[PDB]
Design a protein around this nucleic acid. Structure first.
Lengths: 1388, 114, 58, 57, 63
RNA sequence: UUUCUCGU
């Protein structure tokens, strides 16, 4: 049948409603709050709740509670109890200590291979070979009691969770009873509930599976923090610069976690109001350290006010809620006594002690925001707050509205001028005065300093024609998403359980279901679009132009609790399919057309953003304000006045104004499986349902997510008006919910004043003005949201000043465990996710060994100690891993399976290994090709077991382990299949079963078959012809002699199969395939065993890649004398694909081909790199040089002179793709007919007509300046932006040598990776030697250098197959350029 | 031709007073009607007239004093407190600051309490 | 002097145009969309004109 | 001269547009659910006459 | 020179009636057939001008 | 167990 797999991480919402309902049904009384939820749960319970209560142990527990032996308590109370376990015994403590010691020792053993490779490649200076790791292991012998406690708690909770998940996989409706795993505790954990009972303390509760996952994640996060801090301290003990930037004794951290749990327990669920201020408090200490006298005290006092007001509000809400409920006898006396002041003061003082007046410590303390857990969001309370905020009348001065609209108009005019060199076409040219008419005629614009309030008022009254165009064909990639939607107004009750609905409501639903189509009856986007049999391609366009969303009788907005959000409230909402289409279309057009007029929107890294942003007296300032609640302050009169500008520009009525035209008339209703509203009798529609705390009407406001870009651009216009009114410059960096301001205004400094006490006055005046105009425009932002600063910049929850970045690496790597970011408990995905998450430590905190050892700890845990407990298949992966270990031991001369496991862990993941991130990632992020990097990583790894200098290239050696490995990589049996289409899907693919298969390739088939039998004609035909189109697209270009994978990728992108396969790949990532249309959230056994066999084959890849007999049975092996790794990899790729010549993808590994020398000689011939800052520890200090972005070389193309705005984004992208096609395939025998029919099929133009539209390129080499989406565009260093500023680089000797040898020709190597590798290598040398080198030079190895001249293709693309593939996939082509659109491309 | 200038000074001054009326004109949002059940129009009227309407409960609004102050263009005490050069502390915050900046007298570094 | 004063009168009239147009735009609201007069208030647009044109030509 | 004539020859359309804005505001403001049907069927007649006029010529 | 004076008189009358319309507007909003017909005519002629502009590029295509 | 839930 179908199996239910439950996630091991919450990745969802802890729901107050379901917990209250379950507790109320179990204890026959109001459990959490006196709402209708408890009443309906006690009246007509759910089947799962009945099953949970009917258990004999549950009956005994409720009988004991009724007898008064035990008293009901709260999930927060038991969270505190679990955190302060205080129930360990000597036996389990010894076992946990031994397990942790073994884990640490094995991780250090695995790390030794990587470190030895790094060291002997760098030239610096039993089971462990390096003295550094020897000392590190000798120091990290006994983990401390706090570390052991956290590890033991996490291990016990994970054991309970994995046992429950395995049993749930085995059989459905399982409930796990475990009173033995945790001493003194008791768990009745199920998917629909988790009852925790403490026999010793006589306490009981009702919790949820999400709450249990949250507890486990809290334990895992504390374990991660403890491990990272312990490793950093042990590294810093032996080398100050080696470890992380922060320093903790971690007794303070453990006490801080305990005190946070105590605060939560004292304030019950409402304690997260207080907990929400930890990040702000850290920021307050940061400002105390950095800012001037006035700003620091202002923020400190204001936020003391904030914290105490939040605590008082939490206490009041707690007392109000707890009164008429079963928990009334639970409130601690210290809450009423007011003694919680002492506890909270202790918490803050210990937070400050953890900070230790150190900027790095405070900056990285931002993980406390996530350690303490997540609240159980109350839907009714947050919706009541939203109703109170939104359902109010806002009074505006007509002057203020005119100024805002005029500012938006001025932004539109400035953007149009700067982009298309002309004013937009506007109807009302007569309303302008003579001056503005002259500015219209002479197509320029005035500056802000030369513009006035009169000008803003005048510009308000303008009406434009069309400059932008609506896409006629709906964008399937835009609308298709795995997310969910809401049913219509008459079907909204289907989102509630049948038991919770009244009998007449159930009858109405059963009668109405037959009156609705199969599509809208669903609740998921995929099901809604697939079941839509009567789905016309031009449906969204027709709806938008007919305003069908306006006054729709079946429009209802449903809003559910946020996911993993500690912020109370923040209730995101859903909307039916058609209105969602309209909203997403409006957002897409805003982003792709108008957002180019507002560069401050920051649609994006932070650090670069900050770095281009960073990029008698002048007074500066800085204001940071929150905008999470802004969205609520925008009526029709303030948002649609600027939305009318976009409406006119697109020439469409009420497209961007749909919000405050249809949301007011719909009913805002709570929608959750355990939060139903009271209906009554004979009422079957929301418009007649009376409103209560669960639902309301007449929103008069915005919604989160929807129209965020519109409100962002309106805010930017508002700040431009602010700057005009205040006579100062603004450098806004608005992004998402956080807004950053940088006001600079020249002043005449009066006598006896420094730069201080004038920036403060500027800040106060600007804040008063800013407050005044937000009040006038509707927003009532308080002192809670905003604050002022002078030399500090805050955005995206990041800390920096003086150009030195302070990261949050520990927070980023907080949740790392066995199966993270995976679906169906995928092994390879978990490995990749662990690797990616652990890089962050060395990418942001500048610590190679800390990140590497943390990654090795968790990788070893997952491989050895967690594969045996896989949820789906019990032991198959572990058995296969054991087989691979024995195979590796037999292949090499490894003495022990322990060493075999170490080698497997260090072996690159490309050849079915166990190392997710290779060596190059530690020196430069992006690489041209992965095969060469994998090969060099494997060579360096094998250099541990085979003595190699790594400084003398690769002189042959007596040992034959590396020789055998390389020979076996070279020699294999070729089994090509669908080679060209596989290259077009992945230009770096190997094929012939010589690379790890990702889940998309396996799932593509099953996706095809499930899509073929779908009601939607478009998807049905696309899947029916999918195999034939696959064959045709594979053999379309089998005749070209020199195959170019990147040019093939360009062809594939240009052809309409790209969108269809994007949809297929998106569908392949869902939980269940062939069960999408079955109306069930249970994975099919077909999915289970297909994924299982794919996982087993991926695990058993090293065996096939490395046969024991190294294939050919002879003494002839790969001779290592004068061997080029680039040639090796190119030959491997060509042999694997059975292709005569593959060009353009083979690039040298810079790490291998660039040697390291710290002192010059008689010949330099190297990339000279020196540090400008003359000091030992350059880390944490900013230099005088521009940051090393490492962008690729700029291609040279000429923009054709035509009207850009009249062509849609997809049409322009396809035109650019065809221009790239002409650039790459200019030398084709069949080029004329190929491009002619390609243009006829795709666009509405011919080749001759479209040639003038094509931006003809000027670079003669398409192997060096091509811009394929499969090729990297930037080559940055591993170190962040600021650290790259401390060094200078020069490549003049390299230029001289490369011109002397094979000069005046392009080279395969990339110099951006060269510079990034040099900088990151200098940083790594500083880490490993406690001193940054004065000057470093990189001598290359010329045998890895190749001349990648542009080849002349010889062949004929099969026009018949190209016609067939376009005709079959005729439902995915972009908008054809009609004549009535093309004829205006050459006007003025 | 001073007669035409003298006779257009009148239209100039009445256009100026129309501009002043437009500047003093105020517009309200199209919020829900009284006792719900419908959508009220986005009514527009003279400034002081709608301060009188707000103070006479003609339109329900969460903000009365500060809305009135903003409409009449006067500095309100709430706005001054939000944009104060020095911000004070409520008694809870004063006690919190006293405990934070003072030496640990009780030294109640015990989880068994509270 | 007469030209400059006529120009300043033109600027005031431009301000009247702008303020009245802003009031027209802000005065539609959801109440006009519910009653189906927003299109009359703000004006017919090019997409609706194309819809009418293609309905005629069909 | 012609400058004053051109100036008033733009003032007349400026005032006409002010008139039109006042007309639409006053017909949309007054008449609670009374004239709304009038504007609705006026739009119906307008679209009918527009499509007929596009059919002609 | 009386043409300028007559133009000034008619624009004065138009502006005075404009002020009358603002006064009636604020009075009505606080607490029609010809006006409606005139604004239908205005929107109709605006739509006609826009449609003629669109037919300009239509004719340009048809060439 | 109105597809456990899973927005932009």
């Amino acid at each position: 049948a179908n199996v239910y797999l439950t996630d091991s991480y919450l990745k969802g919402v802890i729901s107050f409603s379901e917990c209250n309902a379950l507790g109320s049904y179990i204890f026959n009384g109001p459990y959490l709050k006196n709402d209708y939820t408890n009443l309906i749960s006690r009246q007509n319970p759910l089947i799962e709740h009945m099953n949970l209560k009917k258990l004999n142990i549950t009956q005994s527990l409720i009988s004991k509670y009724h007898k008064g032996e035990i008293k009901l308590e709260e999930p927060t109370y038991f969270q505190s109890l679990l955190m302060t376990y205080k129930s360990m015994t000597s036996s389990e403590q010894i076992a946990t200590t031994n397990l942790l010691k073994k884990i640490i020792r094995r991780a250090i053993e695995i790390s030794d291979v990587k470190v030895y490779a790094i060291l002997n490649k760098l030239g610096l200076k039993d089971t462990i070979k390096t003295t550094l790791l020897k000392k590190l292991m000798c120091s990290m012998q006994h983990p401390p009691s706090w570390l052991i406690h956290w590890f033991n708690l996490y291990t016990k909770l994970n054991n309970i969770l994995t046992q429950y998940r395995s049993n749930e996989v085995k059989n459905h409706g399982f409930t796990l009873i475990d009173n033995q795993t945790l001493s003194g505790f008791q768990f009745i954990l199920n998917q629909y509930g988790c009852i925790v009972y403490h026999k010793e303390l006589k306490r009981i509760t009702v919790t949820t599976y999400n709450q249990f996952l949250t507890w486990k994640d809290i334990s895992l996060s504390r374990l991660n923090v403890c491990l990272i801090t312990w490793i950093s301290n042990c590294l810093n003990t032996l080398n100050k610069s080696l470890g992380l930037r922060c320093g903790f004794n971690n007794v303070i951290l453990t006490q801080l976690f305990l005190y946070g749990d105590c605060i939560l327990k004292l304030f019950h669920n409402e304690g997260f109001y207080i907990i929400k201020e930890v990040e702000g408090f850290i920021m307050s200490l940061i400002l105390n350290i950095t800012e001037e006298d006035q700003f620091r005290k202002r923020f400190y006092n204001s936020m003391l006010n904030n914290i105490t007001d939040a605590a008082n509000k939490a206490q009041k809400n707690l007392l109000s809620r707890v009164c008429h409920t079963l928990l009334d006898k639970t409130v601690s006396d210290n809450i009423i006594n007011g003694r919680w002041i002492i506890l909270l003061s202790k918490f803050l003082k210990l937070i400050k002690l953890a900070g230790d007046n150190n900027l790095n410590n405070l900056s990285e303390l931002y993980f406390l925001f996530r350690i303490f857990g997540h609240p159980m969001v109350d839907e009714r309370q947050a919706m009541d707050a939203v109703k109170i905020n939104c359902n109010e009348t806002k009074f505006y001065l007509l002057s203020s509205l005119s100024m805002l609209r005029g500012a938006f108009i001025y932004r539109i005019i400035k953007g149009f001028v700067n982009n298309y060199n002309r004013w937009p076409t506007l109807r009302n040219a007569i309303v302008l005065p003579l001056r503005w008419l002259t500015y219209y005629k002479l197509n320029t614009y005035p500056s802000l300093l030369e513009l006035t309030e009169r000008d803003l008022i005048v510009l308000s009254g303008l009406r434009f024609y069309r400059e932008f165009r609506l896409p006629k064909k709906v964008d399937l990639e835009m609308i298709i998403n795995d997310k969910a939607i809401s049913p219509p107004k008459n079907l909204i009750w289907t989102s509630f359980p049948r038991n919770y609905m009244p009998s007449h409501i159930q009858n109405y639903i059963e009668h109405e279901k037959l009156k609705f189509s199969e599509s809208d009856k669903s609740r998921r986007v995929l099901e809604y679009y697939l079941r839509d049999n009567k789905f016309n391609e031009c449906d969204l366009y027709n709806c938008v132009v007919n305003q069908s969303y306006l006054n729709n009788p079946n429009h209802v907005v449903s809003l559910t609790g946020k996911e993993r959000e500690l912020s109370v409230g923040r209730m995101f909402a859903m909307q039916p399919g058609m209105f969602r289409q309209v909203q997403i279309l409006a957002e897409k057009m805003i982003a792709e057309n108008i957002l180019q007029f507002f560069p401050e929107s920051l649609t994006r890294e932070l650090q670069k953003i900050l770095e281009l942003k960073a990029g008698n007296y002048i007074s500066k300032c800085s204001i940071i304000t929150d905008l999470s609640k802004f969205n609520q302050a925008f009526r029709y009169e303030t948002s649609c006045i600027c939305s009318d500008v976009l409406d006119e520009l697109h020439g469409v009525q009420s497209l961007f104004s749909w919000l405050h035209l249809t949301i007011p008339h719909v009913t805002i209703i709570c929608t959750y499986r355990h939060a139903p509203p009271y209906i009554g009798d004979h009422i079957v529609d929301l418009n007649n349902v009376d409103e209560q705390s669960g639902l309301y009407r007449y929103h008069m406001g915005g919604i989160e997510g929807w129209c965020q870009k519109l409100w962002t651009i309106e805010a930017i216009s508002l700040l431009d008006l602010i700057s005009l009114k205040g006579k100062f410059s603004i450098t806004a960096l608005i992004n998402g919910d956080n807004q950053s301001i940088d006001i600079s205004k020249p002043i005449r400094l009066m006598e006896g004043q420094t730069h201080a006490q004038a920036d403060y006055l500027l800040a106060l005046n600007s804040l008063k003005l800013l407050y005044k105009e937000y009040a006038g425009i509707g927003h009532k932002l308080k002192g809670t949201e905003t604050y002022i600063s002078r030399d500090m910049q805050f955005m995206s929850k990041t800390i920096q000043h003086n150009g030195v970045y302070y990261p949050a690496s520990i927070k980023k790597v907080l949740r790392v465990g066995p199966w993270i970011n995976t679906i169906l408990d995928d092994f390879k995905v978990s490995l990749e996710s662990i690797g990616s998450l652990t890089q962050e430590l060395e990418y942001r905190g500048e610590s190679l060994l800390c990140s590497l050892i943390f990654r090795n700890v968790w990788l070893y845990n997952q491989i050895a100690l967690q594969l045996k407990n896989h949820a789906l298949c019990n032991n198959k992966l572990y058995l296969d891993i054991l087989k691979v270990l024995k195979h590796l031991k037999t292949f090499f001369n490894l003495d022990n399976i322990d060493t075999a496991l170490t080698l497997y862990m260090n072996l690159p993941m490309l050849f079915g290994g166990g190392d997710p991130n290779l060596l190059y990632r530690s020196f430069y992020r992006r690489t041209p090709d992965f095969l060469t990097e994998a090969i060099v990583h494997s060579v360096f790894i094998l250099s541990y077991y085979t003595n190699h200098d790594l400084k003398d290239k690769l002189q042959d050696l007596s040992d034959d382990r590396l020789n055998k490995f390389l020979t076996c990589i070279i020699t294999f049996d070729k089994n090509p299949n669908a080679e060209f289409v596989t290259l077009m899907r992945d230009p770096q693919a190997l094929g012939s079963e010589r690379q790890a298969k990702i889940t998309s390739e396996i799932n593509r088939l099953a996706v095809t078959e499930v899509l073929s039998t779908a009601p939607n004609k478009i998807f049905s035909k696309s899947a029916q012809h999918y195999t034939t189109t696959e064959i045709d697209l594979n053999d379309i270009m089998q005749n070209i002699e020199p195959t170019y994978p990147h040019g093939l990728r360009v062809v594939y992108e240009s052809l309409p199969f790209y969108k269809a396969e994007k949809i297929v790949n998106l569908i392949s990532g869902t939980k269940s395939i062939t069960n999408i249309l079955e109306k069930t959230s249970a994975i099919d056994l077909t999915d289970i065993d297909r994924a299982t066999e794919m996982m087993r084959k991926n695990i058993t890849l090293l065996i096939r890649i490395l046969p024991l007999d190294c294939n050919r049975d002879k003494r002839e092996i790969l001779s290592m004398e004068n061997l080029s790794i680039t040639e090796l990899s190119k030959y491997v790729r060509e042999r694997s694909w059975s292709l005569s010549n593959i060009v353009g993808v083979t690039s040298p590994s810079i790490m291998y081909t660039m040697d390291i020398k710290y002192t010059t000689s008689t010949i330099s011939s190297g990339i000279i790199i020196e540090k400008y800052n003359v000091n030992s520890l350059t880390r944490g200090e900013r230099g005088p040089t521009k940051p090393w972005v490492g962008s690729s070389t700029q291609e040279k193309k000429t923009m054709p002179v035509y009207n850009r705005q009249v062509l849609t984004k997809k049409q322009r992208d396809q035109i650019d793709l065809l221009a790239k096609l002409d650039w790459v395939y200019a030398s084709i025998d069949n080029k004329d007919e190929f491009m002619e029919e390609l243009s006829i099929g795709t666009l509405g133009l011919t080749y001759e007509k479209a040639k003038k539209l094509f931006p003809q390129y000027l670079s003669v080499n398409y192997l060096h300046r091509l811009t394929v989406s499969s090729r990297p565009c930037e080559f940055p260093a591993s170190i962040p932006a600021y650290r790259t500023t401390n060094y200078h680089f020069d490549t003049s000797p390299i230029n001289r040598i490369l011109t002397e040898k094979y000069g005046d020709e392009d080279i395969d190597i990339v110099f951006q990776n060269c510079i990034s590798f040099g900088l990151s290598l200098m940083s790594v040398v500083e880490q490993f030697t406690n001193v940054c080198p004065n000057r470093i030079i990189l001598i290359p190895k010329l045998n890895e250098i190749h001349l990648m001249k542009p080849p002349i293709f010889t062949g004929d693309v099969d026009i018949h197959k190209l016609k067939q593939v376009i005709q079959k996939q005729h439902m995915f082509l972009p908008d054809k350029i009609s004549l009535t659109q093309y004829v205006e491309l050459f006007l003025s | 031709n001073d007669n035409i200038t003298a006779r257009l000074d009148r239209i100039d001054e009445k256009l100026s007073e129309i501009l002043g009326m437009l500047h003093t004109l105020v517009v309200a949002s199209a919020g829900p009607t009284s006792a719900r059940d419908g959508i009220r129009d986005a009514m527009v009227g003279l400034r002081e007239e709608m301060i009188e309407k707000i103070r006479t409960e003609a339109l329900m609004t969460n903000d009365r004093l500060e809305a009135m102050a903003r409409l009449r263009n006067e500095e309100s005490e709430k706005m001054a407190k939000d944009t104060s050069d020095e911000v004070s502390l409520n008694p809870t915050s004063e006690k919190l600051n006293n405990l934070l900046e003072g030496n640990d007298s009780d030294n109640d570094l015990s989880l068994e309490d509270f | 002097n007469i030209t400059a004063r006529l120009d300043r009168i033109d600027e005031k009239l431009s301000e009247i145009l702008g303020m009245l147009h802003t009031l027209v735009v802000a005065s539609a609201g959801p109440t006009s969309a519910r009653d189906g007069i927003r299109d009359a208030m703000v004006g017919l647009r090019e997409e609706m004109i194309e819809k009418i044109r293609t309905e005629a030509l069909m």
